[PDB]
Amino acid sequence: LLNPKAESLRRDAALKVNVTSAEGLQSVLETNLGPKGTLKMLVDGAGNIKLTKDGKVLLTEMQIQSPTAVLIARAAAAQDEITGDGTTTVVCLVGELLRQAHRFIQEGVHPRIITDGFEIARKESMKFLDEFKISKTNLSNDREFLLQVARSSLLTKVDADLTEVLTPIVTDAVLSVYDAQADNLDLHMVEIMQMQHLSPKDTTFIKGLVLDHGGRHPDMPTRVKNAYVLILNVSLEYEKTEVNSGFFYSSADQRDKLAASERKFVDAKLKKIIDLKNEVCGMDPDKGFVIINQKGIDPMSLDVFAKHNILALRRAKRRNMERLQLVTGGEAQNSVEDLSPQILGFSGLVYQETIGEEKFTYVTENTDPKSCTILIKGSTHYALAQTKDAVRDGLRAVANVLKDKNIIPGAGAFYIALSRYLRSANMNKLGAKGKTKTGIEAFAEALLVIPKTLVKNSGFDPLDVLAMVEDELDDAQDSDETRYVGVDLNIGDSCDPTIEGIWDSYRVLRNAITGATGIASNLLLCDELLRAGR
Amino acid sequence: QNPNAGLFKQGYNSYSNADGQIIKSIAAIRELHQMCLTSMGPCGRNKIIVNHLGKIIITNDAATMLRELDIVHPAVKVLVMATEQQKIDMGDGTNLVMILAGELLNVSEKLISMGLSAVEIIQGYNMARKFTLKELDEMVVGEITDKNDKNELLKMIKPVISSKKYGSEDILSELVSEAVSHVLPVAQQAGEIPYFNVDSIRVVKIMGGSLSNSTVIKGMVFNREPEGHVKSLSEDKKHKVAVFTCPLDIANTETKGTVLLHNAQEMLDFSKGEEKQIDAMMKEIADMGVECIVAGAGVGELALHYLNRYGILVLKVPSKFELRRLCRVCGATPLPRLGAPTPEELGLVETVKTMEIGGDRVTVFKQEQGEISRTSTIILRGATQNNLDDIERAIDDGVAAVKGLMKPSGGKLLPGAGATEIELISRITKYGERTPGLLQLAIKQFAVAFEVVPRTLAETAGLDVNEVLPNLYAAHNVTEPGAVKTDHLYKGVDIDGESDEGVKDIREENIYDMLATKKFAINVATEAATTVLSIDQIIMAKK
Amino acid sequence: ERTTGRQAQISNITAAKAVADVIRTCLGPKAMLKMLLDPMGGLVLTNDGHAILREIDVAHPAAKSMLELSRTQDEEVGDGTTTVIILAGEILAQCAPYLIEKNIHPVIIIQALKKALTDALEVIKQVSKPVDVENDAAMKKLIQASIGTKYVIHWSEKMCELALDAVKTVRKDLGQTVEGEPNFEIDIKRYVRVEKIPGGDVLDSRVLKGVLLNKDVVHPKMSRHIENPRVVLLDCPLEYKKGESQTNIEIEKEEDWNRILQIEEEQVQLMCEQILAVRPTLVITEKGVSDLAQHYLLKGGCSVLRRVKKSDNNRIARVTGATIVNRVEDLKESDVGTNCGLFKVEMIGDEYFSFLDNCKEPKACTIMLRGGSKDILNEIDRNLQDAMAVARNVMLSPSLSPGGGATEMAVSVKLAEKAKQLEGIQQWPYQAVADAMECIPRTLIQNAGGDPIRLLSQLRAKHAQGNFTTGIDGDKGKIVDMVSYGIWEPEVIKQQSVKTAIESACLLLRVDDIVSGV
C-alpha cells in the first residue's frame, strides 16, 4: 500500500507525532507567558536583534517545518485580528489540552468523543463565563481602574521597570483620543514616533502632533507660547526653469534684475504673509504666528522670519498636514491672495527640541486636538522594538475595555475557578453523558496549565500554590458571599485579583476558550498525514 | 548511534504480540502444513527423509515423518504431540489431525483481522465442537455387527489400508483379515475382557517374488538358518521345545567357577572338559524328549556337533523381545540356567519346517489346531525394498484399527472421502444462525475449516478446485418434496483417474471412515488449535 | 516499466486499496479531518472527501483510474464520492484471496459481480419506501441533507422554497409508453441557470420567471420603464456595415465624398427603420450600439439595450418569442414581446438592472439571489445547485432508502440468502460481495468509536427479524430504527453507488497487464 517516494503515518502514530511536535512549541511559549516569564531573542538572517514575548510575532519570525505549528500559527493570526492579544496564552492552552487528551488516546478513547467532550465543556464554560464576569460601568471616572488594567498589559511585555513609566502615558493616551459618549474609539488616531537617541526611561507622551523637518536658522525662537498655526501651500524658496538654467550677473545692476525674477513669486507671497502679522498679533502679547509651508524656504525669508521671530517650517509631510487640520483647525491655504484671518488656527506652547541629527516640533497644548502621539525612546534597536510591541499591545488591550463593558480578573482567577467549576458541575448535574465525562475531565485538567505556568517561570512550586488556592476556594464555597481568589506571583501566596488590580479582557478570554477548542480538536481529528502533490 | 529498547530480560530471540506473533506461529506451522496436505488420501504423495544413520526412507504417513524431522519450533511440537495422540491411542487419523489443526489456525486469521480476542475464538470452537460431536452420533448410518468373519473384516480393513500404495488395497486386505481372524479367539456373549492385541501380529519381508505370492501362516516365522545338520523336524504333532536364555556352552557353577589359565596341564583339561561336559549336558536334554532347543544367546561350536548326533534342531533368537511373544505360542518358558530342561517349562509345537521364501531357505515355526496360539505372522514378498517398508507400516496401521473395534463404539461407521465433511458444513451453518451472539463469527468459520479436507483430495488427485467443490455442495444440499431428506447423502470425493464424470456414492467401493477415528480426531484437532491460539507469547534461545 | 502475470492483479488491488485507505475515515457526517503535506510547504485541513482526492498525486495507473471515475461521480452527484471507492475497494479486498489463492478465473468473478449487481438493485427496490413528490413539507426534510452543517442552515426554510420553485417549473411528466418516459424530466443545467444579485436580504430572494440582465438604458434621456415591452433580438450590431476583408474606396470625384458620409448615416438609419417595421417598444442588441443608432431609435419610442450575452438571447427568445435574426434587413415580423410582466429597471444595490420577469412559465426561470454580501451569494449559489441536485435525486426516483448503514447491511443479508440457492462456482466470490456490503456500516462504526464486532453482530440481527428498518445513529452511536429519527435518502444515490462500484471493481479486474511506452 505504497508508491515510490512516499511517507505516511497511519494508526495512532500520527497522533503521537502531532502531540509530540506540539509539546516542543508549547515549551517555547511556556516560558514566555506572564510577567514572570522569559524574554527571548529572535534573529533570522537580518542580524536584527528583536526581543518580544508576543506569541504571534515569534511564529512570524521563525520558519517551522512542523505541520502542527502551522495550524497554531493560523490560530495566532485569528486572535490578533479579533482579540489583538493573548496569543501566547492560547498556544499554551492548545498544547496542554493535547497532552491530557493523548494520555486518554492510549486508554482507547476515540478522538471524536474527545472533541465532543470539548464542545459540551465549551457550552458549559460559556455559562460560567457569564456568571463569573464582572460588568464595569461606562463612566469615565474609571481611570483609576484603568491604571490597574494598563499595568496588567504592560508588566507582561517589559521588565516591569518601564511599566510605571508607561502607566500614565498609555492610560492618558486612550482617554484623550476617546471622547466621552457611547461612540467608539479609533487607535489609528494615536500616532507613534520612534527615536533611538534618549534612554527608554525618559520617554514621555505627546498630546499633540510632532513633525520631522523644521526650519533651520540661528535666530529662530526656542519656545513660543500660544501660537497661531497656518498651513501654507505656496513655495517660499527660489525656483528654476524646468530645464537646467542659472542666473549669473556680472554687475550689481544685473543682480537686482536676475534675482527679482526668482523672488517675484516669493516676494508677492512673502510680503502678504508678514502683513497678516501686522493686522493680527502685531500688538497683542501672548500670541504667536507659525507657518507650515510644505515646500522649502529660501535663505532670504529666513532673515525676514528672524526679524519678526516667526517660527519657520519647511518640507512637511503630507500625511501630517491632514492631521494638523484636525489638531490646529486651520484650513490649507493654496494662495496667499485669498488668505484670511478666519483660516488661522489656534495652538498652545510650541517649542522645538534641538538635536544635531534630528529636530522635533510640538503642536501640543491644544483646545480640541482630537489626536495623540506616543513618543517611544530607547538606547538600542531591540529596546525600541520591545517598547513598540508593548504599546501596540497595550492600546489594543485597553481598547477592548471601553468597547466591551465586561471585565474578568486575571492572575489565574478565571482559569482555576473554571477548572474547578467544570469538574464539580458534571458530577452534580450528571446531564452530559456517562462515557463523555472522561474527555470533559481532560479539558478541566488542561485549564490549570496557565496558573501552573505563571509560578513555574518564577520558580515557585505549582503544586503548593494550587493547594493554597483550593483551600481559599473551599472557604469561599462555605460562605454565601462572593470572593475571588488568585495567585500572587511576587509573594507566592494567594491574592484577591480585584484588590491587586490584575484584570483580563472579556473578549480575549471569550475567544480563547472557543479558539483553543477548535484548533486543538482538529489536530486530534487527523488520523493520517498525507504526502502528495509531487 | 541507534539505541535498543523493548527487551528488558536478557539476550534472546524475543517475540511479542505487537509484531503479529500469532501470525508468525501459524506461518511456522504452515511450512510443515503443506507437506501433510498432500499426504492424506489415496492420491496422496510420498516424501523422502534421509535418516541420521545414512539411510533414505520414504513414507506417506506423517506420524513417522514428524519423528524423523528436526523441528526447532515449539508451536509445531504441539501438533506433533497431538499427532502422537492419533498414532498411540488410535490406529488412524495421523494425516487428518495435521490438516484440521493447521486449517483451524488459517481460518482464525480472519477473526484476528477483525480484531476478535483469542478467548472468544477458543470459546467459539468449544461451542462449535459440542455442536459437531452431538451430530456425529446422528451421522452414523450402519453399524458393524462385530461378527469377526473374514468377509466382515474386509469391509473395515479395506478403507484403513487405503490412502497408501493405492491399487494394492484388495490384495493386502485378504492378508490382514486372515491374520486378524487367527489372533481373535473364539468366544460368545462376553464383551468385558479385550482380546485383540497389536503386537500379536509380526510382519516379515524378504526380497524377491511379488505381492501375489504372499501368504498367511499361524505362528512366528524366523528368517535365520537352522545352523546345524538338522534342517527341519518331522510332521508329528506336539514337538517338545526348550527355550534357553543362557548361551550353549560348558556347564558352569553358580558359586564362583572362574576359569583361569596357568599351566599347560589345565589347557588340556579345558579342551577335554568342554567335550565331555557339553556331551553330558546335551544328552540329558535329549533323554527327556526335547527335540528342539531355542537359544536366545550365541551357540558354541562344540554344542552344534553333539546336537547333530542326537537329532535336535538348533534355533537361535538374538532378539529378546520376540521370545516374550514366543511363550504365548508354544508355551515354553525361558531358563536362565542350562542343563535342566524341566518338563513343566517345556512347550509343544505341531509343525516346525524349513521353507523357501523369496528364494532363501528360512525355518518356519507354525502350527495347525492344537495348542492355540495368539500370535500370527504375515509373510510378504517383493522386488522393491522401499515399497515393502510402507506395506508393513500399512499393516501396522491396519491392525491398529482392529483394536478400535472394541466396546467404545467400534462398529459405528460414517461415509468418508469427503462425504461427511461437506454435510457437516450445512449442519454447522444451521447452528450459526440458531445461536445468537458474537459466536456466529467463529461458528461460520468453524464450518469453513472443514473445506480443506475435500480440497486436498481434489488437489492430490489432479482435479480442478473449481469443479469438485460446487459439485459436492449441490449434491449434499437438495430440496426433497417431504419432511425426511432422501436419496444420496453418500457423495464423496471420487478417486477418478478413470470412468466418466463428477462424483459418486462412496458405498459403491465400500469405503468409509470409522466413527472412533473421526470423533476422536475432532477432539484432538480442537485441543491442538486451542493450545496454539492460547499462546500469545513465547521465549526461546539460539539453538 | 511493464508488469505481466498475476503481479499486475496484485498491484491493481493494492492501488485501489491504497486510495481507499485515505478516505476510510472520510465517510459519513462524523468524518474527521485530513492533513495533506504539499511539496511547497502548504497544508489542507479540509475533511471533504472529494476535495482531497483532486489534490492527491498518485503513481500507479490503477490509482489514477479511481480518480477519473470519482471525477465522473463528482459531476453527477455532489456527495457519495467516497462511498463508491470504499465499496469498490472492499470488493477487491474480499475477492483478493479468491482470485489468486483460490485460483478463480477473473471473468468468473466479473460475471458474478454482474449477477450480484442485478440482485443488489432488486433488494434496493424492495427496501425502498414510497415518498410524495408533491408534498412541500416532505421535500424540506430531504433537501436539508445538503443544507445542514452550512451557513444556510438558518435560511434552510427559504432555501427549500427557492429549490422547489425551480424544479417544478422545468419538470415535465409526459408519462406514456408510446415514445418512452423520462420520469419527471428535470433539467438543472440550461434552464435553472442563476444570476447573483448583490445587496438585499436572503429572505427576500425569489425565483423569477424570465431573463435578468444587468445592462441599463444606454441613452441619457429615454423612457426608463415600459408597460408592455416588445423584445426584438438580433445578432449583427447597429453601426455602419463594413466588409469582412480589406476594403479600399478610391473616389476621384469631389462631391461624392460627402455622399459617402450621408450613406453612413442612412445605412444606420436603414437598420433602425427595418426594426421599427414591427413597431417595437424595446430593442435588445447582442453587441454594442453606436451613438448614431441611439438617436434614430429614440424618435421611434423604443428602448435600446446593448451588451447582451449570446447564452441569454437563447433564453430571452423562449421567455418572449422574439426570433433571433442575423442580418437586421432579414428581421422577421414573427418577433413578439408577449408574456412579459414588467420592464421595471428599479435599482438594487446601487446598480441599475433589467427585469424581463412575467407571471407565466416559459419552460424556464431565472433565480434571483440577494444577500448581505457577495460571499453569501457565492455560498448560496453552490448550495442551491446542490440543494436542487438532491431535490432532482428525489424527483427522478420516487422512493427513499434508509441511511446510516441500514441499506448497506440489509442488502448483505439478502445476498447471503440468495447465495445458498445459486449452486455454482460463483457462490464463493458472490459471498464476498455481501462481506463488502458490510464494510460500509462497519466504516461508520470505526469512525464513531464503538466496538465493530459487537455492533455488527447486533446490527445484522435487527435486519432479518426487524423488517430491515434498524440503522445506526451517528450522533449517539446506539443501534436504532431509521423510522423514528427519519433518516432517508433517495434511491438513485443508492443505485448509482452500487452501479459505479461494480463498474469500478470490474474495470480493475479486466486489466491483467500494464505496459509502458509511447
mmCIF file of N, CA and C in Angstrom, chain A residues 186-246:
data_model
loop_
_atom_site.group_PDB
_atom_site.id
_atom_site.type_symbol
_atom_site.label_atom_id
_atom_site.label_comp_id
_atom_site.label_asym_id
_atom_site.label_seq_id
_atom_site.Cartn_x
_atom_site.Cartn_y
_atom_site.Cartn_z
ATOM 1 N N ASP A 186 -10.840 54.987 18.106
ATOM 2 C CA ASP A 186 -10.009 54.733 16.936
ATOM 3 C C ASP A 186 -8.549 54.803 17.358
ATOM 4 N N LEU A 187 -7.844 53.675 17.246
ATOM 5 C CA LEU A 187 -6.436 53.630 17.622
ATOM 6 C C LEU A 187 -5.523 54.213 16.552
ATOM 7 N N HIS A 188 -5.994 54.310 15.306
ATOM 8 C CA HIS A 188 -5.200 54.932 14.254
ATOM 9 C C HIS A 188 -5.014 56.425 14.482
ATOM 10 N N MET A 189 -5.908 57.057 15.245
ATOM 11 C CA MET A 189 -5.800 58.480 15.535
ATOM 12 C C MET A 189 -4.678 58.798 16.514
ATOM 13 N N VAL A 190 -4.043 57.787 17.099
ATOM 14 C CA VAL A 190 -2.943 57.970 18.039
ATOM 15 C C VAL A 190 -1.652 57.632 17.304
ATOM 16 N N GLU A 191 -0.831 58.648 17.053
ATOM 17 C CA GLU A 191 0.414 58.462 16.326
ATOM 18 C C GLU A 191 1.484 57.848 17.224
ATOM 19 N N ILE A 192 2.466 57.216 16.586
ATOM 20 C CA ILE A 192 3.582 56.577 17.274
ATOM 21 C C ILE A 192 4.873 57.059 16.628
ATOM 22 N N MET A 193 5.727 57.708 17.416
ATOM 23 C CA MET A 193 7.015 58.197 16.949
ATOM 24 C C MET A 193 8.137 57.428 17.635
ATOM 25 N N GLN A 194 9.201 57.155 16.884
ATOM 26 C CA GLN A 194 10.311 56.330 17.342
ATOM 27 C C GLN A 194 11.605 57.128 17.275
ATOM 28 N N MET A 195 12.370 57.109 18.367
ATOM 29 C CA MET A 195 13.660 57.781 18.436
ATOM 30 C C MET A 195 14.662 56.888 19.152
ATOM 31 N N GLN A 196 15.849 56.756 18.564
ATOM 32 C CA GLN A 196 16.901 55.895 19.089
ATOM 33 C C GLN A 196 17.903 56.634 19.969
ATOM 34 N N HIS A 197 17.689 57.922 20.236
ATOM 35 C CA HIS A 197 18.679 58.729 20.962
ATOM 36 C C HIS A 197 18.566 58.534 22.472
ATOM 37 N N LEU A 198 17.508 59.071 23.074
ATOM 38 C CA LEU A 198 17.392 59.077 24.524
ATOM 39 C C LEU A 198 17.042 57.689 25.058
ATOM 40 N N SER A 199 17.332 57.491 26.346
ATOM 41 C CA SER A 199 17.081 56.219 27.004
ATOM 42 C C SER A 199 15.581 55.938 27.072
ATOM 43 N N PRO A 200 15.193 54.662 27.180
ATOM 44 C CA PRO A 200 13.759 54.339 27.245
ATOM 45 C C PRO A 200 13.081 54.800 28.523
ATOM 46 N N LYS A 201 13.833 55.053 29.595
ATOM 47 C CA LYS A 201 13.234 55.527 30.836
ATOM 48 C C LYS A 201 12.809 56.988 30.767
ATOM 49 N N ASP A 202 13.287 57.738 29.777
ATOM 50 C CA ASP A 202 12.965 59.152 29.632
ATOM 51 C C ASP A 202 11.791 59.405 28.694
ATOM 52 N N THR A 203 11.140 58.357 28.193
ATOM 53 C CA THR A 203 10.049 58.536 27.245
ATOM 54 C C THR A 203 8.886 59.287 27.885
ATOM 55 N N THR A 204 8.171 60.048 27.058
ATOM 56 C CA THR A 204 7.045 60.853 27.509
ATOM 57 C C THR A 204 5.942 60.798 26.461
ATOM 58 N N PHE A 205 4.757 61.254 26.854
ATOM 59 C CA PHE A 205 3.593 61.276 25.981
ATOM 60 C C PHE A 205 3.460 62.639 25.315
ATOM 61 N N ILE A 206 3.041 62.630 24.054
ATOM 62 C CA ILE A 206 2.867 63.840 23.258
ATOM 63 C C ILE A 206 1.375 64.011 23.004
ATOM 64 N N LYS A 207 0.787 65.059 23.588
ATOM 65 C CA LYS A 207 -0.650 65.272 23.450
ATOM 66 C C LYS A 207 -1.029 65.703 22.038
ATOM 67 N N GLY A 208 -0.164 66.452 21.368
ATOM 68 C CA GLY A 208 -0.401 66.935 20.025
ATOM 69 C C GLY A 208 0.305 66.103 18.977
ATOM 70 N N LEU A 209 0.673 66.754 17.878
ATOM 71 C CA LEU A 209 1.358 66.111 16.769
ATOM 72 C C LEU A 209 2.788 66.629 16.671
ATOM 73 N N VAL A 210 3.695 65.750 16.250
ATOM 74 C CA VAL A 210 5.104 66.083 16.088
ATOM 75 C C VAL A 210 5.480 65.895 14.624
ATOM 76 N N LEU A 211 6.405 66.723 14.142
ATOM 77 C CA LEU A 211 6.841 66.701 12.754
ATOM 78 C C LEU A 211 8.358 66.572 12.701
ATOM 79 N N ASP A 212 8.864 66.237 11.516
ATOM 80 C CA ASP A 212 10.290 65.932 11.345
ATOM 81 C C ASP A 212 11.076 67.178 10.942
ATOM 82 N N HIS A 213 10.897 67.635 9.705
ATOM 83 C CA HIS A 213 11.735 68.697 9.162
ATOM 84 C C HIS A 213 11.243 70.058 9.643
ATOM 85 N N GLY A 214 12.097 70.768 10.380
ATOM 86 C CA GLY A 214 11.851 72.138 10.764
ATOM 87 C C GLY A 214 12.726 73.105 9.979
ATOM 88 N N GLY A 215 12.423 74.390 10.144
ATOM 89 C CA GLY A 215 13.271 75.419 9.572
ATOM 90 C C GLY A 215 14.534 75.606 10.397
ATOM 91 N N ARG A 216 15.650 75.824 9.706
ATOM 92 C CA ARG A 216 16.954 75.962 10.349
ATOM 93 C C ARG A 216 17.457 77.389 10.163
ATOM 94 N N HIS A 217 17.445 78.163 11.246
ATOM 95 C CA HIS A 217 18.043 79.489 11.287
ATOM 96 C C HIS A 217 18.551 79.711 12.703
ATOM 97 N N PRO A 218 19.675 80.413 12.876
ATOM 98 C CA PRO A 218 20.213 80.594 14.234
ATOM 99 C C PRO A 218 19.368 81.492 15.124
ATOM 100 N N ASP A 219 18.558 82.382 14.555
ATOM 101 C CA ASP A 219 17.765 83.328 15.328
ATOM 102 C C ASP A 219 16.348 82.844 15.606
ATOM 103 N N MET A 220 16.006 81.624 15.208
ATOM 104 C CA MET A 220 14.663 81.119 15.451
ATOM 105 C C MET A 220 14.408 80.996 16.951
ATOM 106 N N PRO A 221 13.212 81.348 17.420
ATOM 107 C CA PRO A 221 12.927 81.247 18.856
ATOM 108 C C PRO A 221 12.795 79.797 19.295
ATOM 109 N N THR A 222 13.279 79.517 20.506
ATOM 110 C CA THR A 222 13.232 78.158 21.032
ATOM 111 C C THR A 222 11.829 77.794 21.511
ATOM 112 N N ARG A 223 11.187 78.689 22.259
ATOM 113 C CA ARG A 223 9.870 78.434 22.828
ATOM 114 C C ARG A 223 8.918 79.552 22.434
ATOM 115 N N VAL A 224 7.760 79.177 21.896
ATOM 116 C CA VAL A 224 6.707 80.119 21.528
ATOM 117 C C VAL A 224 5.407 79.620 22.142
ATOM 118 N N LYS A 225 4.787 80.449 22.979
ATOM 119 C CA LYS A 225 3.587 80.071 23.714
ATOM 120 C C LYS A 225 2.355 80.677 23.056
ATOM 121 N N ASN A 226 1.325 79.850 22.863
ATOM 122 C CA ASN A 226 0.040 80.267 22.299
ATOM 123 C C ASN A 226 0.232 80.911 20.921
ATOM 124 N N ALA A 227 0.610 80.066 19.968
ATOM 125 C CA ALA A 227 0.921 80.500 18.616
ATOM 126 C C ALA A 227 -0.158 80.041 17.642
ATOM 127 N N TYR A 228 -0.382 80.851 16.611
ATOM 128 C CA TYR A 228 -1.346 80.528 15.569
ATOM 129 C C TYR A 228 -0.659 79.737 14.463
ATOM 130 N N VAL A 229 -1.269 78.624 14.069
ATOM 131 C CA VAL A 229 -0.727 77.742 13.042
ATOM 132 C C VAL A 229 -1.426 78.040 11.724
ATOM 133 N N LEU A 230 -0.643 78.168 10.654
ATOM 134 C CA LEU A 230 -1.163 78.474 9.327
ATOM 135 C C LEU A 230 -0.534 77.531 8.314
ATOM 136 N N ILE A 231 -1.372 76.781 7.607
ATOM 137 C CA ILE A 231 -0.903 75.895 6.548
ATOM 138 C C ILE A 231 -0.677 76.720 5.287
ATOM 139 N N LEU A 232 0.470 76.518 4.641
ATOM 140 C CA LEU A 232 0.880 77.344 3.511
ATOM 141 C C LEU A 232 1.312 76.438 2.368
ATOM 142 N N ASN A 233 0.589 76.501 1.249
ATOM 143 C CA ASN A 233 0.881 75.652 0.102
ATOM 144 C C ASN A 233 1.816 76.297 -0.915
ATOM 145 N N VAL A 234 2.082 77.598 -0.811
ATOM 146 C CA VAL A 234 2.924 78.259 -1.800
ATOM 147 C C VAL A 234 4.394 77.985 -1.497
ATOM 148 N N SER A 235 5.219 78.088 -2.536
ATOM 149 C CA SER A 235 6.657 77.875 -2.417
ATOM 150 C C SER A 235 7.328 79.166 -1.963
ATOM 151 N N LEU A 236 8.024 79.105 -0.829
ATOM 152 C CA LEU A 236 8.788 80.233 -0.319
ATOM 153 C C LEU A 236 10.254 80.190 -0.731
ATOM 154 N N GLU A 237 10.650 79.216 -1.545
ATOM 155 C CA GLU A 237 12.039 79.022 -1.929
ATOM 156 C C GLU A 237 12.236 79.379 -3.397
ATOM 157 N N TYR A 238 13.457 79.797 -3.726
ATOM 158 C CA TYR A 238 13.792 80.121 -5.107
ATOM 159 C C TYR A 238 13.598 78.904 -6.002
ATOM 160 N N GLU A 239 13.084 79.145 -7.205
ATOM 161 C CA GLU A 239 12.815 78.092 -8.169
ATOM 162 C C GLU A 239 13.591 78.348 -9.453
ATOM 163 N N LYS A 240 13.758 77.286 -10.236
ATOM 164 C CA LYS A 240 14.466 77.343 -11.503
ATOM 165 C C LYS A 240 13.571 76.820 -12.620
ATOM 166 N N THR A 241 13.963 77.134 -13.852
ATOM 167 C CA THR A 241 13.228 76.670 -15.020
ATOM 168 C C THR A 241 13.261 75.145 -15.086
ATOM 169 N N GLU A 242 12.207 74.564 -15.673
ATOM 170 C CA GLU A 242 12.122 73.112 -15.807
ATOM 171 C C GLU A 242 13.368 72.523 -16.459
ATOM 172 N N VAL A 243 13.979 73.252 -17.386
ATOM 173 C CA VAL A 243 15.264 72.870 -17.958
ATOM 174 C C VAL A 243 16.367 73.547 -17.157
ATOM 175 N N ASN A 244 17.490 72.847 -16.994
ATOM 176 C CA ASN A 244 18.574 73.344 -16.154
ATOM 177 C C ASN A 244 19.076 74.689 -16.663
ATOM 178 N N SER A 245 19.077 75.684 -15.779
ATOM 179 C CA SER A 245 19.490 77.035 -16.131
ATOM 180 C C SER A 245 19.905 77.761 -14.860
ATOM 181 N N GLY A 246 20.608 78.874 -15.043
ATOM 182 C CA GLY A 246 21.052 79.673 -13.916
ATOM 183 C C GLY A 246 21.195 81.127 -14.304
#
